[model samples]
Target: GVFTYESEFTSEIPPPRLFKAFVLDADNLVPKIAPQAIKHSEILEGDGGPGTIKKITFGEGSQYGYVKHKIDSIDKENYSYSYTLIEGDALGDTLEKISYETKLVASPSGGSIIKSTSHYHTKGNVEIKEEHVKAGKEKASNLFKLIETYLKGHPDAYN
Candidate 1:
């Protein structure tokens, strides 16, 4: 059976700036901050819009290998994006594919609220453990925090 996960995080950065710097240009910024986690990344297809395929190769000593994701949709005006992980060692033997939809909206404090929804498709009748999902979510959350910290330190960034 498939399982769904949802999470929301608030950032002091505005939606337009956050979306442009962190979300749109993640391929460029991620390696700078977390080189230990992501060795390298590249766009294998498209110009980073809908139908774009990105390949992310993990760093050495990592538990998993690499991941290939296809961009499903991107709405710059709405600060929304969706993508599906089509292939990767991250899928392991239990998962078929993982899809995610993320939206950044302006909050009352002039910052931004990042809301993300994940759908995990299992292989056959296999059931995924909550801990596994939690671990993955935590990693993603950490990445977001790292980016937020980086942006906050650089006042001229993402403008």
Candidate 2:
């Protein structure tokens, strides 16, 4: 089974700053900002571009151990990127992989409007629950909020 969903978020921080922090330097910046949830983001293969696989290691006592994502496409000019989650214990017996497509655009407030589209690929004929999806979305939204707040405070964030 495969499920697709779209989600959007608004940020007070500008698009360039948001993209730099969330996309370009996320592996380095995330653990610095939200150390309580994320322990580290490691590059398992490839350089810093397309087709590379990255591992997400969680903090101590995290609900999950780690997850790996393979970079699919990147459009720096458009501030857009896509990746596939290729491995994780969080998937357990339900998912085979999940794909994510994201973009950040300037808003009327001179901030940013970030959008994310998710494609959830399942295992066998198994289905996913709404709560399961909701939990994932909520976690992501919270992280976005955290990053926005951090950028708003750091004067030297991005260029």
Candidate 3:
């Protein structure tokens, strides 16, 4: 069985600017800013286009040591992309894989709005607990909020 989750939020940053740091150049920016959450991330194949494989090594405090993911699709111009969490301690018997969809749009305030959806595919018909999913969301909040802060500090980045 699979479950879906959706989240949206707004920021003062623009679409392409945020997307560049958070998604397009995440492998290089994340570890530099939030080493506690992500120690290292690299593209294993291709130049990060569709079908590209990437691996992320978590920090010592993280429960999952690492994760392998694939770029399912991307559109830098539109500020949207999707990837699949295919391997790691990030998922256990409760989840088969976690697929993510992300898009950023320009807001009336000249800020950026994020539309994020996640698909949690369970190992089987077994139902997953709500609390268990919160753990995943928490990690994301840390990652994203930190990235937002990073952009603020480096105003010229991805402009």
Candidate 4:
């Protein structure tokens, strides 16, 4: 069975700036903030844009070893991006792949409203555990919060 999860978060930063810093430059910034969770990341192919392939290696002793994803699409004008996890220990034994899409739009409060959807593809006859999904969501949310705090403090970052 396949399950889809959706989440929305708000950031006190403009859409363009938030998208550029958080989504576009994640490989460079993520490790700097969450070194205990993410060991390293890099662009394995292309120039870090649409169709690019990237690999992110989790920190030592982490449950997930690494994840390889291809940037499916990136609409800079709309502040939207999508990617699919092609390989990773994070997939475990039940999941086949995980596809993610994110969109950022200007909020009335002058910051941004960010929405993310995650589609979980499971293996035949396999059922995914809710706790597993919740764990992933929590990790993702924490990462976003870390980045938001970083940008908020720096102010001049991703400008």
Number of the top-ranking candidate, with TM-score as the measure: 2
Put down candidate 4 lDDT per residue, 113-158, tens digits, no spaces. Answer: 8887888888877867888888878877777677777777767767
Q: Could you give candidate 1's per-residue lDDT for residues 20-86 as a string of tens digits?
A: 7655786876776678888788989997888888888888663666788888886799988789888
User: Best candidate, lDDT-wise?
Assistant: 2
Off by over 4 Å in 2: 60-64
lDDT ranking of the models: 2, 4, 1, 3
TM-score of 3: 0.89
Question: Cα lDDT for residue 102, model 4?
Answer: 83
Each model's Cα RMSD: 1.9, 1.7, 1.9, 1.9
Q: After TM-score superposition, what is the CA distance of residue 145 in candidate 1 from its true location, in Å?
A: 1.2
Q: List the residue pairs that clash in candidate 4.
A: none
Worst 10 residues of 3 by lDDT: 139-148
Q: List the residue pairs that clash in candidate 1.
A: none
Q: Report the lDDT tens digits of candidate 3 across residue range 39-67.
A: 79988887777888889887785355888
Candidate 1 has what TM-score?
0.89
Where does the lowest 10-residue lDDT sum fall in candidate 4?
A: 58-67
62: Cα error in model 4, Å: 6.0
Residue 127's lDDT in candidate 3: 62
